[PDB]
Design a protein around this ligand. Structure first.
Ligand SMILES: CC(=O)N[C@@H]1[C@@H](O)[C@H](O)[C@@H](CO)O[C@H]1O
Lengths: 431, 423
């Protein structure tokens, strides 16, 4: 299998505020620039506040604007993946008025809100279903952040309710997607892998939807604790790939590195091209990688305020469309790994899990944890490790299915390097 | 003085959700209907989330759409008053992403947020400054609800900080408004009059800005406690008018009944037309009333959810564009009171206040309180009462300035009917 290469599309000039009045000629130029990198896809982000301003009214103009952006992606030669519910983007929440303050509720447990998200998922798919360039959808960007204990306006849910939420929304379109040749996925930030007590469970990402998504951001403590250009940092995206497979029922389920960037709050801007190149080298040595989607296409204009300062500099293109040095590195990484095939990984570290296949201690597989470091140490040694659970460790069918010949046991100890936020201004904000 | 008559404009068909993609031919039809009533003005409500999606970027298309709505109001023969910051509408909050959750802050005390609201106020005035139909500006609809303790995501502030917030935003445009022939005002819900401990103080509404605004809603406990068609309920808007004057430094400052409706959660729908007519009768007998602005023009379509159901029925025009029975009553009230001049009110009840002019007990002037009931009882008796503070009572200059010849002193007794419901 060969990896797809794509970009998370942040519109130049107006960022996601462009949805208020999209400048289609600029958007056309944006997408042509992305296609010229050699990218085969983009991921795009409509805003929930504009799509569904009332629980029972979806704005047809917002739907038509999503269709027009998909249309222009196809005209640039790009497949277009659409995230349905934002929801959350770049430290900001976009929640419709009917779910805040006087109408505060949980998108995960309020049945009328679930029905609204169901209507929106169906409306987005149905609006785009006739489009050759529409490649698939993700329920929404890192929606799990809303239910984590760290969120300042937390939407409550237990793990069973999260599973029902995922099953409900994915089940609306899964068969259509299967018949049409499209993808359905969901997306969580790395709390699903790292945060003990978090209501989204690893197996949800690795078993629900068509492909596992991971978002790899080394400002999560990895770059700070080990160094921005350490093997732990450069291999972090590959670690998430291999970690996620331990919780997959399917031994060859594809893993989508749906976000990776070189954040300037931990990586020096002069090192970002090398971080890009070497992170993708490590990803390409993991089998069954669905693709790599870089964050992000275009720098945020300096006129916009309240972003973490590093966010402004994440773009492959500057605000006028000029290719940045990281853009050159991503372009070159695409050319390098267009046909890279990773050989099987045959030495596995074992994650102790409970009877449901959930980790006994997610902190042990977080930065600084024993499982995190056991994998990093073997990768550093050239052993190319994979990851399984203790349940699978006693199932030769699954082991043979994955080609695993060697097992390494490791005891659980929490790391303390993991930080659940990307800026110190967002810390200590739980209710 | 003669009263203006206007309507709070809720766009037909799509409500304030139309701002995403306004249907200008429908909006033109909406405004023509309002003018056909005999209304001389509308009050309109852009959304803060669309105007200012980033703290340091105001959306030019959102500004242009406000300009276009004002233009169409003028073409219908209407003056247009614009509320800058919504903020709050019909039980919903519209707060930009840069002031929520991970970026949660208080619009009243966060200096960077205050500068953003300043930039937005200046952008709205400047966008509209060349429009003949642009008549004035209100800072925002019932902005004080964000700082009330009842708010689930409260923006904290003390009373001094609220005064500074008002002074800052009003001062940006007050001189321009005066030179241009326009109005600057601010708007609070009735917590300012009724809620002990609330950081917005009565004197703020009656002294800051060019006219006092009141929003009169008898679901605040008045209709529940006395009855929807009682004199206490029918006179509630006139009560707010006369109560507000007690805290004004200017003895003839105009009072704008900027919202009044007949809410179906307390008033039977069959009684709403007579509630309209008789409430305006009582308002029309108060001097210096700037105008009466009915809530609202057009009913919310039944396809939209999560509104308190009574809210759906508040429009003067039905979802099919037909004039409702309340619309007929409002139309007739305009014709009845176009030329009404209210004679001076000369018997005053006295509100005990402290040395800063703030009430000793706001609950006593709230529904069920002795001062509330003293006014309602005198008005029912035909005594046409007004209201002063205990400070005004020992100041013959002000007394003579208002023509007050008789005082009624009242013992303080707290009311308990106020239920803090403003939506
Ligand atoms: C409040 C905050 O910083 N949230 C960020 C989020 O924007 C980002 O997408 C995610 C990536 O894992 O990391 C979180 O910490």
């Amino acid at each position: 299998s060969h990896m797809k290469f794509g970009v998370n599309y942040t519109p130049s000039g107006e960022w996601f505020y462009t949805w208020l009045n999209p400048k289609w000629e600029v958007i056309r130029r944006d997408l042509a620039q992305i296609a010229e990198l050699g990218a085969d896809h983009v991921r795009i982000f409509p805003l929930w506040t504009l799509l569904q301003p009332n629980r029972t009214w979806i704005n047809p103009k917002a739907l038509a604007d999503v269709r027009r952006m998909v249309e222009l992606g196809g005209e640039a030669g790009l497949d277009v993946y659409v995230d349905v519910i934002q929801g959350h983007l770049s430290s900001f929440d976009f929640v419709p008025s009917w779910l805040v303050s006087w109408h505060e509720g949980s998108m995960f447990t309020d049945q009328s809100a679930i029905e609204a998200q169901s209507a929106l998922t169906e409306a987005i798919y149905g609006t785009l279903s006739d489009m050759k360039a529409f490649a698939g959808l993700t329920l929404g960007n890192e929606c799990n952040q809303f239910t984590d204990a760290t969120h300042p306006r937390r939407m409550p849910a237990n793990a069973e309710q999260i599973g029902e939420w995922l099953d409900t929304l994915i089940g609306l379109v899964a068969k259509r997607c299967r018949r049409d040749g499209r993808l359905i996925a969901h997306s969580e930030n790395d709390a699903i892998w790292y945060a003990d007590g978090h209501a989204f469970l690893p197996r949800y990402a690795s078993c629900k939807g068509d492909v596992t998504t991971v978002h790899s951001w080394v400002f999560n403590g990895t770059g700070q604790h080990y160094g921005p250009m350490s093997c732990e940092s450069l291999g972090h995206a590959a670690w998430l790939v291999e970690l996620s497979k331990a919780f997959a029922a399917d031994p060859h389920r594809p893993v989508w590195v749906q976000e990776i960037g070189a954040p300037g709050n931990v990586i020096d801007s002069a090192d970002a091209p090398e971080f890009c190149r070497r992170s993708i080298d490590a990803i390409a040595d993991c089998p069954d990688v669905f693709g790599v989607t870089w964050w992000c296409s275009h720098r945020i204009p300096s006129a916009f305020s309240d972003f973490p300062f590093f966010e402004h500099q994440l773009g492959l293109f500057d605000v006028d469309g000029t290719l940045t040095d990281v853009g050159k590195a991503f372009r070159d990484a695409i050319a390098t790994h267009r046909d890279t095939v990773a050989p099987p990984r045959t030495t596995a570290i074992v994650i102790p899990v409970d009877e449901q296949g959930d980790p006994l201690m997610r902190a042990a597989q977080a930065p600084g944890g024993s499982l995190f470091e056991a994998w990093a140490n073997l990768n550093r040694q050239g052993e190319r490790p994979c990851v399984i659970t203790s349940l699978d460790a006693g199932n030769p069918a699954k082991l043979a299915n994955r080609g695993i010949v060697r097992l390494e046991r490791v005891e659980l100890v929490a790391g303390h390097a993991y930080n659940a936020v990307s800026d110190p201004a967002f810390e200590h904000k739980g209710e």
